[PDB]
Structure 1
Amino acid sequence: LAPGSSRVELFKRQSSKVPFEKDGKVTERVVHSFRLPALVNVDGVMVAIADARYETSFANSLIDTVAKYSVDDGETWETQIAIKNSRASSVSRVVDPTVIVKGNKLYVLVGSYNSSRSYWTSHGDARDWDILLAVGEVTKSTAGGKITASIKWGSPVSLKEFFPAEMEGMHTNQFLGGAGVAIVASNGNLVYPVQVTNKKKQVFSKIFYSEDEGKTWKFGKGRSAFGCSEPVALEWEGKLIINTRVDYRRRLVYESSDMGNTWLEAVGTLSRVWGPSPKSNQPGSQSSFTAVTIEGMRVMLFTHPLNFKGRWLRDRLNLWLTDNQRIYNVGQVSIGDENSAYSSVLYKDDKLYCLHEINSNEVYSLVFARLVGELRIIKSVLQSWKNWDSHLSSICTPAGCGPAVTTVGLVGFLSHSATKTEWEDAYRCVNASTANAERVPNGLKFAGVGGGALWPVSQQGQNQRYHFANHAFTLVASVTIHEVPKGASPLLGASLDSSGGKKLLGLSYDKRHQWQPIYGSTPVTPTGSWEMGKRYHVVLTMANKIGSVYIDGEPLEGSGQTVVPDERTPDISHFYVGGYKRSGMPTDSRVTVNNVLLYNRQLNAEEIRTLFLSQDLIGTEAH
């Protein structure tokens, strides 16, 4: 939890009471565990919805949906049960409440089970299941000089009539909301990303939406891959972005521009960025994923635990900030090594809050955190992004002013700032590690065996912000070679392995003063010529499985070659710059590199021309 931030235990395990209703009688009843946080703003009234697991934290046990609400930004709260279960058996339950705010209404979607003690995805049929929508109406009043609110919860209505018996190549079984907070789309539609099972017990995600304020519901025709559960969605630039849980695998993210009729994996931006554990081989989690506007910039906030402990412990809740280009780790929201899986982030009246789980010995509370420190960090980072984009965009490039330097898709930039061991990203997301480097204007001068910089891709580890490069990228740099090498030496490239010896696309230079562009594992043909001490502009592009190399804005002869053989997606380890940065590779590149730009797409001709012409105007040195 950041400096300046604080929290309280809001839903207190084995302590907080809720009004338990049974057979016409209501009693204040202590709850064992509270899980499944959803924290929202209903026109000024903060509402926290969760599971109240009365007797045990076990999923298949007695559970009602509880709500706490506050008209004073969380200093005090009132408590009620928003939805009660059927009371059919000792384990009846309403589960995984998923919330949408619209007007003064809360729409809460829950699965309902009567008596099964088995996890829902293990059921062979729907005998124990129903899917219910309950609507809470929030009313505001000003009694006794001060503001008051109340919420009237309607009786739940079953939406089972909207679930078809068949979907493309399958027979349907059950479905649930994705948990947490869902959305109202820019067209007014209520939009629940849902997790669905078929009769083969496979799980997949769909879009379940209503065009009439929840009276009737439809499914989008498309779906995620099998294995994608607890989907969470937001709307971004006219499309739904659906971020999914995949147990034992990296999270998949899809985009849909047609209410779920067609799903496209977001390979160029967010898909496969987030891993559920250090080795991405453990259960995943529910995630808060929202689009907000902070100081005028639309961005997305995303949370997920790091899960160093493994299994479902899910320690180390982390918050991430992205503008769909750069991906910044705000940091850890939970405290120390506590188990802290599910979460919900709310941005309200320029203050940031998080309602999230803490779990000790399988007893769960929900803490309510005031994210003061994190918002300060976010605002600082957003200012940097805005300032560097403005700087670049405002440059008058050589003709009159020619076309502007492009910042669309610009993800990282290594320039003047560097410490003894790192080359700093101007965008503050991913630095490069360095060896044998001396600082020069807008870059670094390298020498010696082991020299160079490494800008990690898969080497980022659990969370791989540059995963997009496996699909498309442009890497740009200005370079100068200081010594003629003994053989062939590296200058810039994308490596598939940790050593640099297995390349996707790279540029080397040799003892005969020629360039050696390297296309995958293809035989290298030296070409062109360079002069010692002369500055050159280098561009490497890859898209559509094809790599190209440009020197001074022009392609090398014979460039535009296949660098991804076969159907497998590359798994780039890192970009190397100015050497391999590997003391085990015997090369010694004596070179200076300045202003390394990384884009998440293949730049066009004009954009490459502009960068070449403007190469002496883009550095961060004077700023």
Structure 2
Amino acid sequence: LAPGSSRVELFKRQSSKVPFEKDGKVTERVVHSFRLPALVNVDGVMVAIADARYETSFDNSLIDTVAKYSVDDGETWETQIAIKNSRASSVSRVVDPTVIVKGNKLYVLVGSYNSSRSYWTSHGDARDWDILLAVGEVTKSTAGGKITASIKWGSPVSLKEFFPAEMEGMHTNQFLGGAGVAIVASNGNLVYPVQVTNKKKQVFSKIFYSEDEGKTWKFGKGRSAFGCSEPVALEWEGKLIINTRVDYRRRLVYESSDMGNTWLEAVGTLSRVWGPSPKSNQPGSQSSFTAVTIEGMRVMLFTHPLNFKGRWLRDRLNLWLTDNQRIYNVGQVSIGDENSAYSSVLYKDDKLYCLHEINSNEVYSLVFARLVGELRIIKSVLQSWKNWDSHLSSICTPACGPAVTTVGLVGFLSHSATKTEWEDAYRCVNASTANAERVPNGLKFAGVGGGALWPVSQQGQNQRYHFANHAFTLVASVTIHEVPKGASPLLGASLDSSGGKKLLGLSYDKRHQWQPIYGSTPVTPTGSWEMGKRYHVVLTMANKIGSVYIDGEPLEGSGQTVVPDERTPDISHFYVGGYKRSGMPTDSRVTVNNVLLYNRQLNAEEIRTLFLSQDLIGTEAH
């Protein structure tokens, strides 16, 4: 939890009571565990929705959906049960409550089970399952000079009639919402990303939506891959971005421009960025994933536990900020090494809040945190992005010519640097350095082991540059200070840790020729360069094809396959001005300035503009 931030235990395990209704009688009952937080703002009223697991935190036990609400931004709350289970058995339950806010209404989607003690995806059929929608109506009043609010919950309605018996290539079994908070699309549709099973017990995600305020429901034709559960979605630039949990694998993210009719993996932005554990080989988690506007910039906030402990412990709840280009690690929301899996982040009246789980010995509470420090950090970072984007866009390029493009600009290494790091102007991913001397807008390297390393898969659990495996443009200005003994590296994308296995790179040789390297293709030296002269270098990769440009012109060999149509590359890092490896035999004596990383292949005009504007883009004077 960041400095300045604070929290309270709002839903207190084995302490907090809820009004338990049974057989026409209501009694204040102590709840064992509270899980699956959903925190929203309804017309000024804060509402926290969750599971009230009365007797145990076991998934298949007695559960009602509880709600707490506040009209004073979380200082005091009123408590109620929003949805009660069927009361058919000692393990009847309404589960995975998923919330949509529209106007003054709360739409809550829950699975309902009567008596099964087995985990839902293990069920061979749907005999024990129903899917329900309850609507809560929020009213505000001022009886007494003070703001008050009340929420009237309606009876749940089964949506089972809207679940087709078959979907493309399968027979349906059950479905549930993805928990947390879903959305109202810009066209007014209620949209729930849902997790669905078929009769083969496979799980996948779908879009489940309503065009008539929840009276009838439809499924989008498309789907995620199998294995994608607990989806959470938001709308961004006209598309739904569906962010899925994949147990024991990296999280898959999809985009859909047609209400789920077609799904495309977001390989160029967010897919496979977030891992569920350091080695991405443990169970995943529910995630808060929202689009908000902070100081005029539309951005996305995403949470997920780091899970250093493994299994479902899911310690270290972390918060991420992204504009669909850069991906910033705001930091750890939870405290110390506590288990803290599920969460819900709310941005209301320029204040940031998070309702999240804490778990000790499988007894769960929900803490309500005021994320003061986090918002401060977020605002600073967004200012930096807006500022550098503004700076680059404002440059009068030589004939003013076309503007330098910032669309897809993810990283920028320029003037800022410490003894051992080259700092990302966008503040997301620094490069490590060796044998580097600071110069205006860059670094001058020399000696065996010299260079800088801008990590890709080397980022570890969370891989912000995963997009580079699909497409990228890497740009830099370079100057060679000594003729090498053989062939020496200048810039490239490495597939392994050494730099010996390259995806695409540029070297230079003793005969004053360039050596562009295209994957494992035999190298053909070409062109010519002279010592002390500055050159503009661009490496592009898209559709498995690599190109290398010098001074805005493509070199011989460009347009070559760098990826066997077989697999998808797993780039380790970009190397700059050397390999940064004392064990590699080369000595690169060169200066590199203004390294730009884009998440797409730049077009000819964009490359020319960068070439012509080399002397104008540095961060030095700012």
- Structure 1 residue 150: deviation in Å? 0.3
Name the counterpart of 2:282: 282
CA contact 2:91–2:115 (8 Å) conserved in 1: yes
Kept after mapping to 1: 8 A contact 2:13/2:365? yes
Q: Distance in 2 between matches of 1:117 and 1:22?
A: 21
Structure 2: unaligned runs, 5 residues or longer: none
Q: 1:323 Cα shift?
A: 0.2
Does the 8 Å CA contact 2:40/2:346 hold for their aligned counterparts? Answer: yes
SS of structure 1 residue aligned to 2:161 = helix
* Paired position in structure 1 for 2:409: 410
| Aligned twin of 1:599 | 598
Listed one character per residue, the Cα deviations across residues 343-395 of structure 1 (whole Å, up to 9, x for unaligned) are 00000000000000000000000000000000000000000000000000000
SS, match of residue 66 in structure 2: strand
Cα separation, 1, equivalents of 2:519 and 2:558: 12
Instruction: Provide, for residues 239-286 of structure 1, a one-character-per-residue CA deviation record: whole Å limited to 9, x for no partner.
Output: 000000000000000000000000000000000000000000000000
Shift of 1:98: 0.1
Structure 1 partner of 2:44: 44
Distance 1:561 1:335 in 2: 50
CA distance in structure 2 between the partners assigned to 1:49 and 1:372 by the alignment: 22
| Structural mapping, 1:161-180, within 5 Å | 161-180=161-180
**Whole-Å Cα distance in 1 between the matches of residues 423 and 370 of structure 2?**
30
Instruction: Write the deviation string for residues 507-537 of structure 1: whole angstroms up to 9, x where unpaired.
Output: 0000110000000001000000000111100
Offset at residue 179 of structure 1 (A): 0.3
**1:19-58 → structure 2 map (5 Å cutoff):** 19-58=19-58
Deviations 1:413-470 (A, max 9, x none): 0000000100000000000000000000000000111100000000000000000000
What are the within-5 Å matches in structure 2 for residues 381-392 of structure 1? 381-392=381-392
Structure 1 residue 565, shift from structure 2 partner: 1.2
Q: Secondary structure at the match of 2:373?
A: helix
Q: CA deviation at 1:213?
A: 0.2
State the distance in 2 between where 1:223 and 1:97 align: 21
User: What is the CA distance between 1:157 and its match in structure 2?
Assistant: 0.2
Q: Distance in 1 between matches of 2:104 and 2:558?
A: 60
CA distance in 2 between counterparts of 1:555 and 1:46 reads: 57
SS in 2 for 1:378: helix
**Cα deviation, residue 548, structure 1:** 0.3
Q: String of CA shifts for 1:8-41, please: whole Å, max 9, x gaps.
A: 0000000000000000000000000000000000
User: How far, CA to CA, are the matches of 1:104 and 1:558 in structure 2?
Assistant: 62
**% identity of equivalent residues:** 100
- CA apart distance, 1:297: 0.3
**1:76-134, CA deviations, whole angstroms, 9 ceiling, x for partnerless residues?**
00000000000000000000000000010000000000000000000000000000000
Q: Which residue of 2 aligns with 1:266?
A: 266
CA distance in 2, matches of 1:614, 1:478: 11
Q: CA deviation at 1:294?
A: 0.3
For 2:450 and 2:55, locate their aligned partners in 1 and report how far apart those are by CA, in whole Å: 61
The answer as to 2:485 corresponding to 1:479 is no
Task: Please report how far the alpha carbon of residue 4 of structure 1 lies from its aligned counterpart in structure 2 after TM superposition.
Answer: 0.5
Q: CA separation in 1, counterparts of 2:488 and 2:557?
A: 20
Q: CA deviation at 1:143?
A: 1.2
Matches within 5 A, 1:90-169: 90-169=90-169
What is the aligned partner in structure 2 of residue 425 from structure 1? 424
Distance in 2 separating the partners of 1:153 and 1:89 = 23
Q: In structure 2, what is the equivalent of residue 549 of structure 1?
A: 548
CA distance in 2, matches of 1:404, 1:557: 28
d(CA) in 1 for partners of 2:548 and 2:505?
Answer: 8
Shift in Å at residue 586 of structure 1?
A: 1.1
- How much has 1:558 moved relative to structure 2? 2.5
Secondary structure of 1:28 counterpart: strand
Task: Give me the whole-angstrom Cα distance separating, in 2, the residues matched to 1:134 and 1:311.
Answer: 33
Q: Please name the residue that 1:187 is paired with.
A: 187
Match status 1:509 vs 2:474: no
- Mapped to 2, the partners of 1:31 and 1:603 lie a distance apart of 57
User: Counterpart in 2 of 1:616?
Assistant: 615
Q: 1:272-316 CA distances to partner (integer Å, 9 max, x unpaired)?
A: 000000000000000000000000000000000000000000000
Alpha-carbon distance between aligned partners in 2 of 1:513 and 1:591, rounded to the nearest angstrom: 14
- Contact kept? 2:544, 2:565, Cα under 8 Å: no
Superposed displacement of residue 566, structure 1: 2.3
C-alpha distance in 1 between matches for 2:518 and 2:553: 17
CA deviation digits over 1:223-251, x for unaligned, max 9?
00000000000000000000000000000
Distance 1:563 1:507 in 2: 13
What CA distance in whole angstroms lies between the structure 2 residues aligned with 1:579 and 1:542? 21
**Could you give the per-residue CA deviations for residues 464-492 of structure 1, whole angstroms, max 9, x where no partner exists?**
00000000000000000001001100000
Q: Answer yes or no: is the 8 Å Cα contact 2:109–2:134 preserved in 1.
A: yes
Per-residue deviation, residues 208-231 of structure 1 (Å, max 9, x unmatched): 000000000000000000000000
Q: Within 2, Cα distance between the matches of 1:537 and 1:41?
A: 51
- Where 1:75 maps in the other structure, the secondary structure is coil
SS of the aligned residue for 2:532 comes to coil
Residue 202 of structure 1 is matched in structure 2 by: 202
CA distance in structure 1 between the aligned counterparts of 2:275 and 2:621, rounded to whole angstroms: 38
User: 1: distance between equivalents of 2:586 and 2:556?
Assistant: 25
**Following TM superposition, by how much is the alpha carbon of 1:559 offset from its aligned partner in structure 2, in angstroms?**
1.2
Q: CA deviation at 1:560?
A: 1.3
Partners of 2:585 and 2:546 in 1: CA distance = 26
1:559-607 CA deviation, whole Å, 9 max, x = no partner?
Answer: 1111011221000000000000001101110000000000000000000
Question: 2:565, 2:535 → 1: CA distance?
Answer: 33
Q: Deviations over 1:130-181 (max 9, x none)?
A: 0000000001100111000000000000000000000000000000000000
Query: What secondary structure sits across from 2:615 in the alignment?
Result: coil
Q: Secondary structure of the residue that 1:385 maps to in structure 2?
A: helix
Gaps of at least 5 residues in structure 1 are: none
Distance in 1, matches of 2:558 and 2:92, equals 65
- 1:127 and 1:427 map into 2 onto residues whose CA distance is 53
Distance 1:259 1:534 in 2: 54
CA distance in structure 2 between the aligned counterparts of 1:499 and 1:97, rounded to whole angstroms: 48
- SS class of match (2:616): coil
For the residue of structure 1 that corresponds to 2:614, the secondary structure is coil
Distance in 2 of aligned mates of 1:228 and 1:108: 22
* 3-state SS of 1:143 partner: coil
TM-score normalised by the chain length of structure 1: 1.00
Query: For 2:532 and 2:618, how far apart are their aligned partners in 1?
Result: 20
Do the aligned partners of 2:494 and 2:503 also contact (CA within 8 Å) in 1?
yes
